[PDB]
Amino acid sequence: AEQVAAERAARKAANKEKRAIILERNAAYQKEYETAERNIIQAKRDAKAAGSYYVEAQHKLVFVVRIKGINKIPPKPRKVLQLLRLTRINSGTFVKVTKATLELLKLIEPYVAYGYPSYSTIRQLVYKRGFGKINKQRVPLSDNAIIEANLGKYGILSIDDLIHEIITVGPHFKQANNFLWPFKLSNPSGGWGVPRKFKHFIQGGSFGNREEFINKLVKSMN
Amino acid sequence: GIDHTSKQHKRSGHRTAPKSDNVYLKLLVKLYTFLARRTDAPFNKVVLKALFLSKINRPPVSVSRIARALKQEGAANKTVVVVGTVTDDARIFEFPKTTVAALRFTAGARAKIVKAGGECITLDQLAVRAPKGQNTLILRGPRNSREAVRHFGMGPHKGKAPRILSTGRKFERARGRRRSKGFKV
Amino acid sequence: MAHFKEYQVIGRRLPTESVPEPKLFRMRIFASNEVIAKSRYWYFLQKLHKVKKASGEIVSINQINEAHPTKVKNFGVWVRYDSRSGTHNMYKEIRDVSRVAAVETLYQDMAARHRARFRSIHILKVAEIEKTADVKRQYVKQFLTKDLKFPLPHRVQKSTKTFSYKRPSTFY
Amino acid sequence: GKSHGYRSRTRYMFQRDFRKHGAVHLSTYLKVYKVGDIVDIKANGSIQKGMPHKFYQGKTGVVYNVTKSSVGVIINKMVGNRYLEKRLNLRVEHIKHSKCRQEFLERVKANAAKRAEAKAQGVAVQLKRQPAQPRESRIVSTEGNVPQTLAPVPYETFI
Amino acid sequence: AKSKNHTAHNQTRKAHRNGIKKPKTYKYPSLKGVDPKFRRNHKHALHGTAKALAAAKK
Amino acid sequence: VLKKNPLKNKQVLLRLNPYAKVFAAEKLGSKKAEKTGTKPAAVFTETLKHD
RNA sequence: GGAAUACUGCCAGCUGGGACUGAGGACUGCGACGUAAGUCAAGGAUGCUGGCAUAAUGGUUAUAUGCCGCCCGUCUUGAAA
RNA sequence: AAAUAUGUAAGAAGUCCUUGUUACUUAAUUGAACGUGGACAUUUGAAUGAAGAGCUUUUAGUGGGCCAUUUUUGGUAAGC
């Protein structure tokens, strides 16, 4: 064959329609998030207007980042971190919220600082600190064709597809979280903000659950 | 630092190249690494893997053992390949024509096979005929039948052939072997 | 512990198959952020009822923005501090601006003389004294005289550099 | 010296019971034991014959031998740094069926029960045991239930 | 010349360096200790079905 | 050969997420919302202000 | 009755200044802008200037300065002792 | 009668229907062990992780320890 006119044009033709699928699916997604908050903010308004109170569903996933170093770790907590893929100091992974999973967090609090993240925080983490996994071999995410080569047979033919499952907790979420290398973050830019880092967030420290306050801490690292 | 869930800088533990400093043997690796890397068949990989073994892991195959593989159902015309040396067995009379491929054919193997109509074949000759190993049968000689393996890991109530120079009476049948003399093992 | 913000918290427990919607309790709490706010409510319900953090649920969290954050209100507050050799109660009255300001200036003042940390102090109730001359402690009534006035002696100015040229005075 | 006897340090361990003394009832004998059944060990001090060592108590094993008036069990003892297959032969009064296992039995048919229904209607298997999922969004009511203010109680000794 | 009597420190740390092996049961476990009267059955039971399976298929 | 992160260096942000082009055209980070007239019920306000 | 403001959060909002590095060494990957040729900030630098042109840069050596740094080997729970 | 800790199970060496052999057992092809023919497949039936899992031989050195949080023994106490 000549390989100058036929295959390359078709290869671009196949590539160009793939972007359209990604764009069309994103248009489906972008409509979904806006309806999400617009229906939970309005429902919060209507509860008070009806003389009631609205309790939203608890956050379905948390971002857990290690605070302590590696020395002087008891054996039971240490095994928890290894199974959580949290190896280094200032390393983070998204953890599905579940009573089975939640018990490890309350057993690993003195060495982690976790909380409920927001879509903005996930948006930068996937884009900036995006690392794949292909026969180990941690490589940057970058292109939108590496993901479909590793996750396409679990759907998810785009990075925007992946970032939707990592926040909305899709059906096949465990390996989608497991496909991403643990997020290796730097020290906070504005500082930890507390004199001593190893007090609980209630006691004026850093470790333990902090709900929505984790967004501010992660943005400095990322 | 980095917490280690495994041992860092660990070796694969397998032989990537033969320790034998044989100029001809390395040529066998030369041909097969080309096939194993490029031919999408496991026959090339297993032959290459089995070719880096030592002599202990490369036991001599009796010529009668091949005969068993030929009245194996459905393997009448299947060619046989084996890495190592093929010996002769003085307890077989019937031998099918067939075709045998190996590294070193002993004098008995070199005579019994050819007189039955077969031909001794080297690993290079099968490559030009069966690059991927079509209609090819592999077999390995007995490994746990070596003299030294019967002494491995002996202990009380295991009966694993304690190492002794002279056998017979007065040699390792006293107290610790029979109930009348002390105890039994 | 920080720039304090009051909060209200509502808790409905877990509705069992027998007694749904049990009581929808409420409490007024004094904290700095919502994260600590959701933790003090449980710490205060456990001391009065037979429910705990596991057997409970936060219904709503709200902030009471002051209706008159500009008028100088009067406050009388009761405190129960776990001191070194037991616990005690007092009636201390202060007026900064409002509740969130009064609570803030309470804790430094409370920890200044009694060395009671934030975790060893109980806030009983915060209320505005409606009618004047209903206060007992003299150091607060002292600033309610008609058209009060006093000077500020011994003024000290903030130097910019390390050297001065005129031996500055302390007038005002 | 030091005492390391066969049944040493067993003073609250082999007590029969409180208000349950006397001869054992007849239900423990009338149960059928078959080879390959998960059981539990609870030593009975009433009859010392065929009674396990103090180490084995509450341990769970598999039935492999069933003789006339005793049952053989295997215990995966952890000694040193490894597991060894310890075989124990115990009488029928120091043993009882482990109903942790039996719960799995009807679970097998329970999944199989709606397995037929799953293929009858279509797909929708979802037979993997989901853990305790977080609660979803719910609304509370105030009509007839008004919030009640609460304050910490002032200190008082009442003694 | 008093010495250290006994100490169990570092024994679990030493033991766990190799993973603590699972006792690795097999299919058709060893029949040691089985009732001899049933074992006499077990030899003859398979012997009878040995020819039964062989005679059936031809 | 080099890791060029998204957000900055817009070009690498265009090979990813083709929706990012139309996102900037119609803002979508400063979109105006619709206002309503549902003032909270009077049975809630006194609970908020109650001692 | 009416806003604004404060607090928090978001923008695939626009930018100004400073600091370190520029590794790799045909073309061959996903892109963006233009129907169009082509171009680009897209798989990691080029363009233009100048002064010296040889002890000027730089190495070694001696001294000075700011800071740090206790003689080795040895048994030993533990040493410079 | 706690808290910590601890044993076992979460299944393809699995379940269901017909059926054989046995010198055991049973009044009784009635019971017990395993196979013969057919059905259940990738949510095949808890969570997370897995620089792969398992296995063998050989041997250096090691067999004076000490300290700290937590519990506790002897002694008033001790850098006992």
Add this chain to the structure above:
RNA sequence: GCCCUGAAAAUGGAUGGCGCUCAAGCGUGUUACCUAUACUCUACCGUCAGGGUUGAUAUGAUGCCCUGACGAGUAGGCAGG
């Protein structure tokens, strides 16, 4: 609560020293600021691991190249020089 009495030892000698008292002391918050061989990004050295590379003129396929992660350490083991 602070402070004070209670409170007496031996080469002159201590919150590290100077010193400091609406203090540089005491208790409590607010920020901003300085850094380790800690974390982040990059180049290089080595090890390990996973892979591509017989096409000939023209040099090594016990070679060439690509990617990723690691690097402490007495007794001790092995390997390359």
